[PDB]
Amino acid sequence: VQLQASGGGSVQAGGSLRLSCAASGYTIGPYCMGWFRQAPGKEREGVAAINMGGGITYYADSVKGRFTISQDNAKNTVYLLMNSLEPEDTAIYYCAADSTIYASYYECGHGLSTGGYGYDSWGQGTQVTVSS
Amino acid sequence: KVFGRCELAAAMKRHGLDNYRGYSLGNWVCAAKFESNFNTQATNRNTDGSTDYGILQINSRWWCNDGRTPGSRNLCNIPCSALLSSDITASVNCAKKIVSDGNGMNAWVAWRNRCKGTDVQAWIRGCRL
Numbered sequence: 001v002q003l004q005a006s007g008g009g010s011v012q013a014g015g016s017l018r019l020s021c022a023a024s025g026y027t028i029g030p031y032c033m034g035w036f037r038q039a040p041g042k043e044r045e046g047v048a049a050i051n052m053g054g055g056i057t058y059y060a061d062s063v064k065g066r067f068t069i070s071q072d073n074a075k076n077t078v079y080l081l082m083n084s085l086e087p088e089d090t091a092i093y094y095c096a097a098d099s100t101i102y103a104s105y106y107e108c109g110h111g112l113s114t115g116g117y118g119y120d121s122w123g124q125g126t127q128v129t130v131s132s
Numbered sequence: 133k134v135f136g137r138c139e140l141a142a143a144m145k146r147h148g149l150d151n152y153r154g155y156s157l158g159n160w161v162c163a164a165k166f167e168s169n170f171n172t173q174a175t176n177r178n179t180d181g182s183t184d185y186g187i188l189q190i191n192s193r194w195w196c197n198d199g200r201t202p203g204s205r206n207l208c209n210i211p212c213s214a215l216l217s218s219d220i221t222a223s224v225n226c227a228k229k230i231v232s233d234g235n236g237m238n239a240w241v242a243w244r245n246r247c248k249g250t251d252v253q254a255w256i257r258g259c260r261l
Contacts (some may be wrong), residue, residue: 027193028205053193053203054180074203101207103230103239104167104189105178118238 001025003123005095007080010055013087015129019080021095023121026076028122032098032108033078034058035069036116038092038125047093050078053090063089087130095123133218135187137161138259140220145261147224157261159243160227160254164188165255166242170225173216186215186223188240195226199204207233233253 007019023030034049049058057069068081074130096119098111107128111118135143141161144150145200150157168174176184182193191206198212208220208226212222215223230239236244247255 028207029193030202044191045203053205054178054182056180063185088238100235100238101194102241103191103195103227103233105176105180105182105191106241 001030001097001099001121003076003095003097003121005085005093005123005126008022008093008126008128010131011085013085013130013132015085015130016081016083017085018082019093019095019126020077021080021123025075026085026099028102030076030097030099030121032119033071034096034108034112034119035080036094036112036119037091037118037128038094040090043072044116045091046073046109048080049108049112051108052076052105055127056107058107058112060113061127065122082128085128085130087132090129091128092125093128095126097121133172135164135172136164137170137255138171138261139165140187141256142261143220144224147221148160149224149227152228153229153236155237156253159237159247162186162250162252162254163237163240163243166246167240172218174219176217183212186213187220187238188215188223188227189213189242190223190226190230195230241242 002024004022035047039043066084098118192198195208196212197204197206227241
């Protein structure tokens, strides 16, 4: 399978950006899709996730209220709308999916905030830079 | 029906779950305990409108259709109501597809949080099998 990410670039603090990610080559799933980000000198942070289909979302505390993730007509594509971008938000953003089709209900944000456990498919990172 | 540990262990061995895909019987009994507490009628509703049915809490958005979960993929091509039977047969059949489909026993959240990595065989020792 392959994850195709696009968007990102440079923007002035306060602006907004929208990243998108397209999972390709799936028969079923993925069950989860989310975003991770890696800034210099910091730990890899899980930013947002969503249960495919079900639509339920999860967000890191640092981006709650500013970011919004959504699915596109079950088309296996998700978007990450980032508003009120601040320079601390400067980082490399990664799209990731969890290919497991769980038997019992599973909350995608769980693995998101615990080392990305379960997310087995990663895409090419995309640089996002917020200048002053 | 609310099975007893050893009673269910016996009934699962009879359905060939023992060493299925290499999973020793203890896994399936442990999963059942923290999923449904051995209750074949247990049904838990989830925030996305889906529901988990039966002894192995199978979900209605992916594995079975209960007629009220928008988008049900119904991968086990069976109604969910069939999973609330005192006869674990339908549940085991479905549970087998979920595992042989490459999901492994990870598919069960409860198994991953309460059984995986522990001495799962403790779940069947002391049983007449």
